[PDB]
Design a protein around this ligand. Structure first.
Ligand SMILES: CCCCCCCC/C=C/CCCCCCCC(=O)O[C@@H](COC(=O)CCCCCCCCCCCCCCC)COP(=O)([O-])OCC[N+](C)(C)C
Ligand SMILES: CCCCCCCC/C=C/CCCCCCCC(=O)O[C@@H](COC(=O)CCCCCCCCCCCCCCC)COP(=O)([O-])OCC[N+](C)(C)C
Ligand SMILES: CCCCCCCC/C=C\CCCCCCCC(=O)O[C@@H](COC(=O)CCCCCCCCCCCCCCC)COP(=O)([O-])OCC[N+](C)(C)C
Ligand SMILES: CCCCCCCC/C=C\CCCCCCCC(=O)O[C@@H](COC(=O)CCCCCCCCCCCCCCC)COP(=O)([O-])OCC[N+](C)(C)C
Ligand SMILES: CCCCCCCC/C=C\CCCCCCCC(=O)O[C@@H](COC(=O)CCCCCCCCCCCCCCC)COP(=O)([O-])OCC[N+](C)(C)C
Ligand SMILES: CCCCCCCC/C=C\CCCCCCCC(=O)O[C@@H](COC(=O)CCCCCCCCCCCCCCC)COP(=O)([O-])OCC[N+](C)(C)C
Ligand SMILES: CCCCCCCC/C=C\CCCCCCCC(=O)O[C@@H](COC(=O)CCCCCCCCCCCCCCC)COP(=O)([O-])OCC[N+](C)(C)C
Ligand SMILES: CCCCCCCC/C=C\CCCCCCCC(=O)O[C@@H](COC(=O)CCCCCCCCCCCCCCC)COP(=O)([O-])OCC[N+](C)(C)C
Ligand SMILES: CCCCCCCC/C=C\CCCCCCCC(=O)O[C@@H](COC(=O)CCCCCCCCCCCCCCC)COP(=O)([O-])OCC[N+](C)(C)C
Ligand SMILES: CCCCCCCC/C=C\CCCCCCCC(=O)O[C@@H](COC(=O)CCCCCCCCCCCCCCC)COP(=O)([O-])OCC[N+](C)(C)C
Ligand SMILES: CCCCCCCC/C=C\CCCCCCCC(=O)O[C@@H](COC(=O)CCCCCCCCCCCCCCC)COP(=O)([O-])OCC[N+](C)(C)C
Ligand SMILES: CCCCCCCC/C=C\CCCCCCCC(=O)O[C@@H](COC(=O)CCCCCCCCCCCCCCC)COP(=O)([O-])OCC[N+](C)(C)C
Ligand code: NA
Ligand code: NA
Lengths: 525, 115, 115, 63
């Protein structure tokens, strides 16, 4: 206070490299101004002292285009690490500013403070902004949540949808769904306007487009199966049935024409989608773009077998059978239309990655290691009788140990071994390591995996269905986007018309006299 | 018994039948004709025959012969091992683990449901 | 204290910081700089790193008597010190040990199978 | 604990000239006529706000 009264500049910018650090541990970014420093260090009395001075510019920008509200979003952390002061500093500065100038400003990346909070995964700040309700009368128009009517314990509220629904580019909903960097997407979709908005899109258009996608892909697999199982098997009946290489006026010819056409449409559509969302991270290849990859491989193998028969290279039948088997396995994509089967597919993905791959690595080491040792103990069988041992080579010994694991066939300990006691010692040691130890430990480790991921599997499923909804929404014509319209136009303030989403509520615990409302008469009007 | 059938068993059977019928057609269409000199040269000679062989493999009955009448013997063995990993290693063992979660929840309420 | 496994006393000594001015040189942890919430500290390594005999790090790793070795290695200067040795030299010597032992098993297998 | 035993066994089979190349820590002046080898660790703390009095360097950058 002594320095400010003597003429200290309240608008200085500390712009050195220590104040704009390349790595986190080498400095401290705070927004470069004395007002931003006092806010980020939890000094509320100096913040009040600075804003009362009429030389303080509350709407200035730093070197990267951030204002005071962008900087508070950048330093925010969760409640276990930082408590709640940053959210309290956001509210105090915004109400003093008194208009919408700060929250509509864009930084050098072109992002508002609301867009920046979604981009960086700041879930505590995002919850506060989306449901901000100001009951005091002169500052009421800065709200994003409004009370429409109330009677006793029952009330009806309206949520502002301005930059959060997908009617504009880089909306809050789109940023959260496609953000492969952060790790808390499935927690942020539980928040209040976002959850009902995805529910409304599913009920109106998205559930019917999902059923029609299932029916076309099922009929595609039926026809591909029937023309491959019922090929002309005669050596004299050369021509392959698919695509009608010899026009014969055969009825139901359109299925053979459907498969060649529909495989091209998949290969173009999945060729574009892999291009636009390319991952630089193997964890994001498995978690977002897996079924884009396997639908693309299946459609290429169908096209590649067509060219191999038209040149008659005989390897076309191998490409067809791999395409049929992968095609029926691809039907597990459509389980995400249901909650019960969708959560079950989430469990399958986690168990393969955490449990099954570790088992297979150790099992193959024991299989190939004991296989060579048993095979090199067997003598030559060139003398009088053939077929004197089933362990006569490395390939033969590995097959016998594999059949033992899955319990098929018979067990003969009387081989052509030089040392029969040593042969039986190594065989029993293999049984203890695999039948007693590794297979039973796999069941016990899966029980630990099921216990952990069952807490989160519902929220992981809803994130997967949300990506399906927004992809269906982009392929609609613009005249049909106007027919399916979320929200209603409402007058929330004097000369202020906003599109809003209605949510009802019943609350029995906090009794108050209702003062702030948009309508005196509480019915549906 | 009633809770385990509805929560666990029905979900298993749906995914298992998809893998059984899907791998069954692919293996059966890879087998050549056996009209030449000897009969009984393959046990995977039709769709009905291939489904029966994969079912017996699951419950562990009979013998395993990899020497069928396939045009591509390496491709035949690749698809057969993939079926074993999906069913013997993955789905049957995951069923036991999911039943353990069901038993833990409903054991709190099963006395009052009986009364 | 390291020899007898006294983990509470050992934690206190390794990170002792005295902020009072005339007795400040008895510290083993020093603040180098600080700005707001960010700071950078220095830990004394005199008799704890393996540059001398019977150091604190060597005593803990080879102490077969006590039962809490794996809890004492979580303490603050010891944890980063093992991380630094792995990144600079130890991870490359581990890979070279693997390659020599793998080639030894390949050759022993091939000359015994192809006698 | 198992990996730690592997690290110290690798460290003993190195030549003495190569032990000097891989050297943990930096030489620092912690007091008047007192030079010690030290290991640096960074930290961020949001909960206890205090005026900073005890430090070795006024200027807080990497120097
Ligand atoms: C390119 C070929 C692949 C298969 C090759 C086989 C060996 C290579 C194996 C490589 C490693 C396998 C690891 C896969 C990990 C993810 C699996 C998965 O998504 O789980 C899903 C279970 O349903 C399935 O799809 C899994 C069944 C196994 C694959 C099918 C075997 C092939 C069948 C015929 C063989 C013909 C093979 C012809 C070509 C050789 C459910 O997961 P989710 O919870 O819903 O989340 C993911 C979805 N999301 C990303 C959209 C959000
Ligand atoms: C615990 C249970 C689990 C076990 C699993 C592991 C156990 C593996 C068990 C292996 C036993 C089989 C080997 C015995 C040798 C037989 C003879 C033979 O033909 O060998 C041939 C090689 O054959 C191959 O190359 C095998 C191809 C499959 C590779 C692994 C499958 C990939 C699974 C991915 C899917 C992942 C699923 C997706 C993930 C969700 C060559 O040998 P040969 O001497 O020249 O034979 C004559 C050749 N001829 C026949 C053409 C004339
Ligand atoms: C009011 C509710 C409906 C409103 C909208 C309806 C109009 C449609 C709107 C816009 C037009 C569609 C744009 C392109 C269509 C290409 C088709 C295609 O390639 O398959 C696509 C499905 O695509 C679907 O959306 C399924 C429905 C087929 C649409 C056919 C339009 C004619 C309507 C019906 C014609 C007569 C049927 C009459 C039935 C009574 C591919 O499926 P995918 O899931 O996108 O990708 C695969 C999964 N993956 C992500 C893992 C890779
Ligand atoms: C089941 C088959 C067994 C055999 C398959 C073997 C392979 C198995 C593979 C995978 C197993 C899963 C199979 C996929 C299931 C179907 C997809 C689906 O999810 O539908 C869903 C909706 O869809 C509907 O609306 C119901 C269909 C009514 C007819 C509407 C036709 C659309 C045309 C109209 C427009 C004409 C426009 C065209 C002309 C312009 C049903 O899900 P739900 O839970 O009811 O949704 C409510 C969810 N909620 C409550 C959470 C909010
Ligand atoms: C036992 C009596 C004696 C035998 C009777 C034998 C004949 C029986 C005939 C018909 C009964 C067959 C089951 C239908 C009812 C299932 C109820 C259910 O939970 O569905 C759930 C998913 O489950 C699915 O629907 C996924 C697909 C299942 C395949 C059957 C198609 C369903 C349409 C029937 C057409 C028949 C086709 C099949 C013909 C066999 C609903 O999905 P969800 O709501 O999103 O998730 C629930 C979670 N939640 C509740 C918290 C939200
Ligand atoms: C199957 C067909 C061929 C596939 C081969 C290549 C597929 C590899 C491609 C992708 C999977 C690799 C992991 C990427 C994502 C990490 C997540 C994860 O769960 O990984 C886990 C397993 O990973 C391991 O460390 C297991 C060791 C060997 C796996 C690879 C060789 C397969 C072994 C023989 C198979 C061939 C058999 C074929 C013949 C029978 C890491 O362990 P975790 O601590 O529990 O992870 C927790 C999550 N975390 C990382 C965030 C901490
Ligand atoms: C995409 C990647 C995934 C691929 C699958 C997953 C990777 C799988 C890894 C490996 C699979 C293949 C192993 C290499 C051996 C080749 C086999 C062979 O050719 O047989 C030949 C050489 O056989 C020999 O010389 C003896 C065996 C040599 C290797 C020793 C195995 C122990 C390795 C233990 C540790 C290994 C694993 C460690 C843990 C993972 C001769 O055999 P035959 O019976 O006389 O053939 C008769 C037919 N013929 C006469 C016409 C020729
Ligand atoms: C710290 C303690 C752990 C390690 C201890 C050892 C240190 C390891 C160091 C050296 C190994 C010692 C063996 C020397 C090599 C000679 C091999 C040989 O000649 O074959 C012999 C068998 O051999 C076996 O079956 C047993 C070999 C393993 C013994 C270790 C027991 C493990 C504990 C489990 C205890 C139960 C296992 C008992 C199962 C018998 C005999 O050969 P043959 O086939 O009989 O001759 C032809 C047949 N004829 C007689 C008709 C003419
Ligand atoms: C078996 C003989 C033929 C029967 C066919 C028809 C029988 C269907 C009739 C009645 C059962 C349907 C459910 C009604 C009551 C719901 C309660 C429930 O537990 O359902 C669960 C399973 O439901 C599923 O979604 C599984 C998907 C397919 C089931 C139906 C096809 C059977 C698959 C192939 C079978 C044919 C094999 C025949 C040849 C081998 C829903 O999942 P959940 O989340 O865990 O539920 C928790 C409770 N909740 C709903 C309150 C949330
Ligand atoms: C109440 C409801 C419950 C009922 C049970 C539960 C439902 C079960 C569902 C389905 C069971 C039946 C499947 C349909 C095929 C009929 C079989 C047939 O007739 O064989 C004929 C046609 O065979 C073919 O043409 C090839 C197979 C065509 C279908 C492809 C299966 C893959 C589906 C994968 C996904 C499907 C499932 C998805 C997940 C659920 C010929 O076969 P054959 O061997 O040459 O016959 C010899 C004798 N003969 C010459 C005298 C004629
Ligand atoms: C992102 C990565 C995942 C996907 C990767 C691939 C992308 C998918 C895209 C295209 C598929 C590529 C194959 C092209 C089609 C040709 C088929 C063919 O000719 O049959 C071949 C076998 O084929 C096989 O057995 C292996 C086929 C699957 C390979 C994928 C490995 C999965 C990982 C698991 C790793 C272990 C699996 C290794 C098992 C060998 C050879 O035919 P044949 O029977 O030998 O000929 C007659 C016998 N004769 C020689 C005596 C004359
Ligand atoms: C900057 C990073 C590197 C700096 C150091 C590099 C120089 C090395 C420093 C000192 C010299 C080594 C002293 C003796 C070596 C004897 C070898 C021996 O017996 O095997 C030992 C491995 O030993 C190893 O450390 C693996 C590396 C081989 C060292 C060969 C030196 C030439 C470098 C490369 C030559 C050309 C290759 C070129 C490659 C591009 C035994 O392994 P173990 O794990 O100790 O014990 C077995 C496990 N157990 C504990 C359960 C029992
Ligand atoms: Na059995
Ligand atoms: Na058996």
């Amino acid at each position: 206070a002594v320095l400010i009264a003597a003429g200290a500049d309240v608008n200085a910018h500390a712009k050195g490299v220590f104040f704009n650090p390349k790595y986190q541990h080498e400095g401290f970014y705070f927004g470069e101004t004395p007002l931003a420093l006092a806010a980020c260090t939890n000094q509320p009395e100096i913040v009040q002292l600075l804003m009362e001075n009429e030389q303080t510019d509350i709407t200035s920008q730093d070197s990267r285009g951030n204002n005071i509200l962008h900087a508070l979003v950048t330093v925010a952390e969760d409640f276990k690490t930082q408590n709640d002061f940053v959210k309290r500093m956001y509210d105090m500065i915004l109400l003093r500013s008194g208009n919408w100038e700060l929250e509509t400003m864009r930084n050098n990346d072109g992002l508002t403070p609301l867009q920046l909070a979604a981009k960086m995964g700041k879930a505590e700040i995002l919850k506060y902004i989306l449901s901000r309700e100001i009951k005091e009368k002169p500052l009421r128009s800065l709200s994003r949540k409004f009370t429409d009517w109330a009677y006793g314990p029952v009330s009806s509220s309206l949520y502002d949808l301005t930059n959060v629904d997908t009617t504009t580019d880089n909306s809050v909903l789109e940023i959260i769904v496609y953000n492969t960097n952060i790790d808390n997407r499935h927690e942020m979709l539980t928040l209040e306007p976002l959850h009902t908005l995805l529910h409304t899109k599913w009920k109106k258009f998205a559930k019917y487009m999902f059923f029609l996608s299932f029916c076309f892909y099922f009929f595609y697999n039926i026809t591909l199966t029937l023309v491959s199982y019922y090929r002309p098997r005669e050596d004299e009946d050369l021509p392959h049935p698919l695509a009608l290489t010899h026009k014969m006026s055969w009825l139901q010819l359109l299925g053979r024409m459907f498969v060649l056409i529909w495989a091209t449409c998949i290969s173009v559509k999945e060729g574009i989608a892999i291009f636009l969302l390319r991952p630089s991270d193997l964890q994001s290849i498995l978690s977002d773009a897996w079924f884009h990859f396997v639908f693309f491989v299946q459609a290429v193998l169908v096209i590649l077998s067509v060219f191999l028969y038209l040149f008659a290279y005989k390897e076309y039948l191998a490409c067809l059978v791999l395409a049929m088997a992968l095609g029926w396995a691809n039907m597990l994509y459509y389980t995400r239309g249901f909650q019960s089967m969708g959560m079950y597919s989430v469990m399958i993905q986690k168990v393969i990655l955490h449990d099954v791959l570790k088992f297979l690595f150790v099992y193959i080491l024991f299989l190939l290691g004991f296989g060579v040792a048993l095979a090199s103990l067997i003598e030559k069988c060139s003398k009088d009788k053939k077929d004197c041992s089933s362990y006569g080579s490395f390939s033969d010994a590995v097959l016998e140990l594999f059949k033992l694991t899955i319990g098929l066939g018979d067990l003969n300990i009387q081989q052509n071994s030089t040392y029969p006691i040593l042969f039986l010692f190594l065989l029993i040691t293999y049984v203890i390591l695999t039948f007693v130890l590794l297979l039973n430990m796999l069941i016990a480790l899966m029980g630990e995996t099921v216990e952990n991921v069952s807490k989160e599997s519902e929220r992981i499923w809803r994130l997967q269905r949300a990506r399906t909804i927004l992809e269906f929404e982009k392929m609609l014509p613009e005249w049909l986007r106007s027919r399916f319209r979320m929200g209603e136009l409402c007058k929330v303030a004097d000369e202020d018309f906003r599109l809003c989403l209605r949510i009802n509520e019943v609350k029995w615990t906090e009794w108050k006299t209702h003062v702030s409302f948009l309508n005196e008469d509480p019915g549906p009007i």
